[PDB]
Design an enzyme around this catalytic site. Structure first.
Site, PDB file in Angstrom:
ATOM      1  N   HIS A  83      34.094  28.802 -40.444  1.00 17.32           N
ATOM      2  CA  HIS A  83      35.334  28.669 -39.693  1.00 17.32           C
ATOM      3  C   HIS A  83      35.887  27.292 -39.990  1.00 17.32           C
ATOM      4  CE1 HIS A  83      32.034  27.056 -37.294  1.00 17.32           C
ATOM      5  NE2 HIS A  83      32.896  26.095 -37.021  1.00 17.32           N
TER       6      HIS A  83
ATOM      7  N   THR B 278      29.552  21.373 -32.529  1.00 16.31           N
ATOM      8  CA  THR B 278      30.661  20.547 -32.051  1.00 16.31           C
ATOM      9  C   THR B 278      31.439  21.202 -30.922  1.00 16.31           C
ATOM     10  OG1 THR B 278      32.173  21.421 -33.727  1.00 16.31           O
ATOM     11  CG2 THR B 278      30.969  19.383 -34.256  1.00 16.31           C
TER      12      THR B 278
ATOM     13  N   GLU C 217      36.660  17.019 -37.881  1.00 12.85           N
ATOM     14  CA  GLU C 217      35.795  16.599 -36.797  1.00 12.85           C
ATOM     15  C   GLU C 217      35.064  15.328 -37.215  1.00 12.85           C
ATOM     16  OE1 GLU C 217      33.772  20.392 -35.417  1.00 12.85           O
ATOM     17  OE2 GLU C 217      35.227  19.968 -33.820  1.00 12.85           O
TER      18      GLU C 217
ATOM     19  N   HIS D 206      38.433  23.764 -38.490  1.00  7.21           N
ATOM     20  CA  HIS D 206      38.929  22.966 -37.378  1.00  7.21           C
ATOM     21  C   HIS D 206      40.116  22.302 -38.052  1.00  7.21           C
ATOM     22  CE1 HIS D 206      35.428  23.270 -34.709  1.00  7.21           C
ATOM     23  NE2 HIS D 206      34.747  23.370 -35.837  1.00  7.21           N
TER      24      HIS D 206
ATOM     25  N   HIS E 237      33.499  24.622 -41.874  1.00  7.43           N
ATOM     26  CA  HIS E 237      32.108  24.619 -41.459  1.00  7.43           C
ATOM     27  C   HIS E 237      31.449  25.929 -41.862  1.00  7.43           C
ATOM     28  CE1 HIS E 237      32.821  21.411 -38.088  1.00  7.43           C
ATOM     29  NE2 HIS E 237      32.617  20.865 -39.272  1.00  7.43           N
TER      30      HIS E 237
ATOM     31  N   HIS F 204      39.154  30.034 -30.063  1.00  5.87           N
ATOM     32  CA  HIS F 204      38.879  28.626 -30.345  1.00  5.87           C
ATOM     33  C   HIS F 204      39.139  28.320 -31.819  1.00  5.87           C
ATOM     34  CE1 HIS F 204      36.035  29.625 -26.919  1.00  5.87           C
ATOM     35  NE2 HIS F 204      36.836  28.712 -26.399  1.00  5.87           N
TER      36      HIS F 204
HETATM   37 ZN   LIG Z   1      32.847  23.976 -36.508  1.00  2.71          ZN
END
Ligand SMILES: [Zn+2]
EC number: 4.2.1.1
Length: 257
Positions: A91, A195, A103, A93, A116, A61
């Site tokens: 990590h 999230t 996000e 996104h 994050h 992911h």
């Molecule tokens: Zn995250």
């Protein structure tokens, strides 16, 4: 299972995780003209002095850089937080294009990526118990924009070739997370959730106002990662972000005017 495609993306999550349509879901759009300046917010305290990174992992992911959180070596305190929160991992996104990837959004503006830094409330003993509490986690959100390269991020970028597919992990000791912070610590804060599934509403979100710059070459390497495992058809790991959710009965506070 769940993912970010058309058939298993954020629009489908509610079927296996009904909390997806819950009371305090994340991310959300931050309307800067609606956020309230809260003078009762204490200064934010980021103590990553003794941070002890351990590994970097591709989990299908995104990729996580994990830290040793058996002690208070890297903690977040102050701000809207009570008690001590230990850094357990960080990590990102990101998008397939520079105009998307983050996000949270600011007045609807999307950033190329979002960092994050995940911390858990020590009062709860371990991460697993913490996610079951409304104030169990504290995630520091940092926006990334395409501009000049970020020195502190190159070390992460250099090892991405070793964890290209899902399940791959590599040693990643002595990484200093302080290298990923912008100059200012002004932020917005609100109560929310993870999230990604299980989308537990256990998070106190702290989103920094000031983004950090990364180079196009750096973001391009993120886009070279794979969602799939080795030997499986190739799916580029891009656009692993959940879109903004309704704010509903929540208020976003700001630490600055
Ligand atoms: Zn995250």
């Amino acid at each position: 299972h769940w993912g970010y495609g058309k058939h298993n993306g954020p629009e489908h999550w509610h079927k296996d995780f009904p909390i997806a349509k819950g009371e305090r879901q994340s991310p959300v759009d931050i309307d800067t003209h609606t956020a309230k300046y809260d003078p009762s917010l204490k200064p934010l305290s980021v103590s990553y002095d003794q941070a002890t990174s351990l590994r970097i992992l591709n989990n299908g992911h995104a990729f996580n850089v994990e830290f040793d959180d058996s002690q208070d070596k890297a903690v977040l305190k102050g701000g809207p937080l009570d008690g001590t929160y230990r850094l357990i991992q960080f990590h990102f996104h990101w998008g397939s294009l520079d105009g998307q990837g983050s996000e949270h959004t600011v007045d609807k503006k999307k950033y190329a990526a979002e960092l994050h830094l995940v911390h858990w409330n020590t009062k709860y003993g371990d991460f697993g118990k913490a996610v079951q509490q409304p104030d169990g986690l504290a995630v520091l959100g940092i926006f990334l924009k395409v501009g000049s390269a970020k020195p502190g991020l190159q070390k992460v970028v250099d090892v991405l070739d070793s964890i290209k597919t899902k399940g791959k992990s590599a040693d990643f000791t002595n990484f200093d997370p302080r290298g990923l912070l912008p100059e200012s610590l002004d932020y917005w804060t609100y109560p929310g959730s993870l999230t990604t599934p299980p989308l537990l509403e256990c998070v106190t979100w702290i989103v920094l106002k000031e983004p950090i710059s990364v180079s196009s070459e750096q973001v391009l390497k993120f886009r070279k990662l794979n969602f799939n495992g080795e030997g499986e058809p190739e799916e580029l790991m891009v656009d692993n972000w959940r879109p903004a959710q309704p704010l509903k009965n929540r208020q976003i506070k700001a630490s600055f005017k």
